[PDB]
């Protein structure tokens, strides 16, 4: 008769990193990093995103002739841009408060474009048809932004402008206009007659006076003068007012909208799909089951915290050593046949042979391991400098806790062997391979007495030999 002790073995190929060793295979482990992918840009919530192709946000909201006219979905949860989408503001200049505007238009519930100032009626004392340029071509001819009108002098005079609109739509209206900055004084006179001009856009929420600068720029996009683009939000009831004596690109179409909170912009070449998935990334989506992810710093929605790590996997079980292939510390090889628990015995007598796990040591380990794994997930709840240091702090903690895990198993096995060794001092000798050579024959019910933890030896060892 012979009784031996051993650990669990499995066909798992999960590898974890410890303090001393790395790429260590274990029987059971939990990952702390989900970057699993091949997901395709989908749609957060039922609401699909607005896809910008051949244009950016500036060209879309201003209405560059090269962009696709409405169209335009009524509602969108986010906006997707292309890196090769660089034709936006056709006329040179810069968009004032562009980052702010990008975040406003990110998420919207209702969106409607309307003709705030009709070209035919609103401007009787100024020429609106001449407002075209070579910088904004449509069909091999001079054109301009669909949403704006470039007012030019009507003959030999540019009368003082004063137009206003009252927001009766019942929801905040986005108004956009432009201020022209000519190249030379000759062009300034040829466009608005007057020399010392000014522009003023007043409202309850916004007020600013623009004095246009007449100067020769480097001349890019075939235009020597520049044009700055401004915008504001008119609350329902507030009245926008446009007082100006020249150099003003009045608006034609405003946007009545009801914005939504949060969200952002994605700049990627990935296409759109209809799988209705709820987090999103710059390139695809994820299942967000894990509290960490490593795809891109930019994330939309309730996604895991981004962490730039090669791999994070916390170990739960013990080292997997099956050692049985091809032809065939103190103990070598694992118990593939035993699946009852992590630690167990193996009896051998005339009645039969079989494996059995010690549930007192196994259940106490599962309770402590599960408790320790949850204690680590409770630590991640700590919500560029912090990112790199927290990543290293998390890496160090996973490596540290992996060594404490495998040593806790190594100790639990040594305690199980000492439990058997202390019961039968002389009735059985130590083989040295984690087994015990029973001198006296011990039946199945006698083997259970060792498992129960109640063994006596009133019988002689029989070890007389020799």
């Amino acid at each position, epitope marked *: 008769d012979t009784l031996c002790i051993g650990y669990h073995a499995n066909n798992s190929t999960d590898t974890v990193d410890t303090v001393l060793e790395k790429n260590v295979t274990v029987t059971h482990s*939990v990952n702390l990093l989900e970057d699993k992918h091949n997901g395709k840009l989908c749609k957060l919530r039922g609401v699909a995103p607005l896809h910008l192709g051949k244009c950016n946000i500036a060209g879309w909201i201003l209405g560059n002739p090269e962009c696709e006219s409405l169209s335009t979905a009524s509602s969108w949860s986010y906006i997707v841009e292309t890196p090769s989408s660089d034709n936006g503001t056709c006329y040179p200049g810069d968009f004032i408060d562009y980052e702010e505007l990008r975040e406003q238009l990110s998420s919207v519930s209702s969106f409607e474009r309307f003709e705030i100032f009709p070209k035919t009626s609103s401007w009787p004392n100024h020429d609106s048809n001449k407002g075209v340029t070579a910088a904004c071509p449509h069909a091999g001819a001079k054109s301009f932004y669909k949403n704006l009108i470039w007012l030019v002098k009507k003959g030999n005079s540019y009368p003082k402008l004063s137009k206003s609109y009252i927001n009766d739509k019942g929801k905040e209206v986005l108004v956009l206009w432009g201020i022209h900055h000519p190249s030379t004084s000759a062009d300034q006179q040829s466009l608005y007659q007057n020399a010392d001009t000014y522009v003023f856009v007043g409202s309850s929420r916004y007020s600013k006076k623009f004095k246009p600068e007449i100067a020769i720029r480097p001349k890019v996009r075939d235009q020597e003068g520049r044009m700055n683009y401004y915008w504001t939000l008119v609350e329902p009831g507030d009245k926008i007012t446009f007082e100006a004596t020249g150099n003003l690109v009045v608006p034609r179409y405003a946007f009545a909208m009801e914005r939504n909170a949060g969200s952002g912009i994605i700049i990627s070449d990935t296409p759109v799909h209809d799988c209705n998935t709820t987090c999103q990334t710059p390139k695809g989506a994820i299942n967000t089951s894990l509290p960490f992810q490593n795809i891109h710093p930019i994330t939309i929605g309730k996604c895991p915290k981004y962490v730039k790590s090669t791999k994070l996997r916390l170990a739960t079980g013990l080292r997997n050593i099956p050692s049985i292939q091809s032809r065939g510390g103190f103990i070598e090889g694992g118990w593939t046949g035993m*699946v009852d628990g992590w630690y167990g015995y193996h009896h051998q007598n005339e009645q039969g042979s079989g494996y059995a796990a010690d549930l007192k040591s196994t259940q106490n380990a599962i309770d402590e391991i599960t408790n320790k794994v949850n204690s680590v997930i409770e630590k991640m709840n700590t919500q560029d400098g912090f990112l790199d240091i927290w990543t290293y702090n998390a890496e160090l903690l996973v490596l540290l806790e992996n060594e404490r895990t495998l040593d806790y198993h190594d100790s639990n096995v040594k305690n199980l062997y000492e439990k058997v060794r202390s019961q039968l001092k002389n009735n059985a000798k130590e083989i040295g391979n984690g087994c015990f050579e029973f001198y006296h024959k011990c039946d199945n019910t006698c083997m259970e007495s060792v498992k129960n933890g109640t063994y006596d030896y009133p019988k002689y060892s029989e070890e007389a030999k020799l």
Partner: antibody
Framework: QVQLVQSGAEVKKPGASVKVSCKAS????????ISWVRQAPGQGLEWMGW????????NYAQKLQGRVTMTTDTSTSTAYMELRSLRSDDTAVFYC???????????????WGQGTLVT | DVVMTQSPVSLPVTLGQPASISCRSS???????????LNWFQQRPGQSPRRLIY???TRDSGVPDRFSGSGSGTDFTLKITTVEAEDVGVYYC?????????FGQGTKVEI
């Protein structure tokens, strides 16, 4: 096809014990764990115990640990449950369903019982 | 024991529009490799409960795609797009890994 069946409704006075059976039909009996749960009208649900045909070791509810007892048979493929003392608020509808083979593996109630309504 | 706190205990809804229930625990559930929660159950009046979404997200076999359980760690929900008339009964939360299961108050759906 792998639906399980159990004993019908019963009735016992406060003091006398009661026994309920749960046979595994249609199996597919790889000898994996069986569990028991109660549900009294007006309350909710609470675990009673668990037993396995692979593992002889069982688990009980600390509160009712003393009274409850679990047994099973591999040949007939049937699990038994028994209670000692009875009272008005301990009376509830008892269900039985499969759980798991090993302790280390996951849990699942793929198939459920009928519901032995005992008063 | 894990404290499975349900909310709300009474859930009044109508047809067409979706719904959502919330469950939170005292300790987080993991149980070795993401074994996690067991699921949610739908118990019709005078009938046994059936499986729905085992392992938090994995749906059950023989169950429409209208149901969808989602969550990570403690909390939060099980969403059902478009409520039919047959979707009525009592619902309860999953066991807390550790043997003390401790089920919910099993909130009552009504149309």
């Amino acid at each position: 096809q792998v639906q399980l069946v159990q004993s019908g409704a019963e009735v016992k006075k406060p003091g006398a014990s009661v026994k309920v059976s749960c046979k595994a039909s249609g199996y597919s009996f790889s000898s994996y764990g069986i569990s028991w749960v109660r549900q009294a009208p007006g309350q909710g649900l609470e675990w009673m115990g668990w037993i396995s045909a692979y593992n002889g070791n069982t688990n009980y509810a600390q509160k009712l640990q003393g009274r409850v007892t679990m047994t099973t048979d591999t040949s007939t493929s049937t699990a038994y449950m028994e209670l000692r003392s009875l009272r008005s608020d301990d009376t509830a509808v008892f269900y039985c369903a499969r759980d798991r083979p090993h302790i280390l593996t996951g849990f699942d109630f793929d198939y459920w019982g009928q519901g032995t309504l005992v008063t | 024991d894990v404290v499975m706190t349900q909310s709300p205990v009474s859930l009044p809804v109508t047809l067409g529009q979706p719904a959502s229930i919330s469950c939170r625990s005292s300790q987080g559930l993991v149980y070795i490799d993401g074994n996690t929660y067991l699921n949610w159950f739908q118990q019709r009046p005078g009938q046994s409960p059936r499986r729905l979404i085992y392992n938090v997200f994995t749906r059950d076999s023989g169950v429409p795609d209208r149901f969808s359980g989602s969550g990570s760690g403690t909390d939060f929900t099980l969403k059902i797009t478009t409520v039919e008339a047959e979707d009525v009964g009592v619902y309860y939360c999953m066991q807390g890994t550790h043997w003390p299961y401790t089920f919910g108050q099993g909130t009552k759906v009504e149309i």
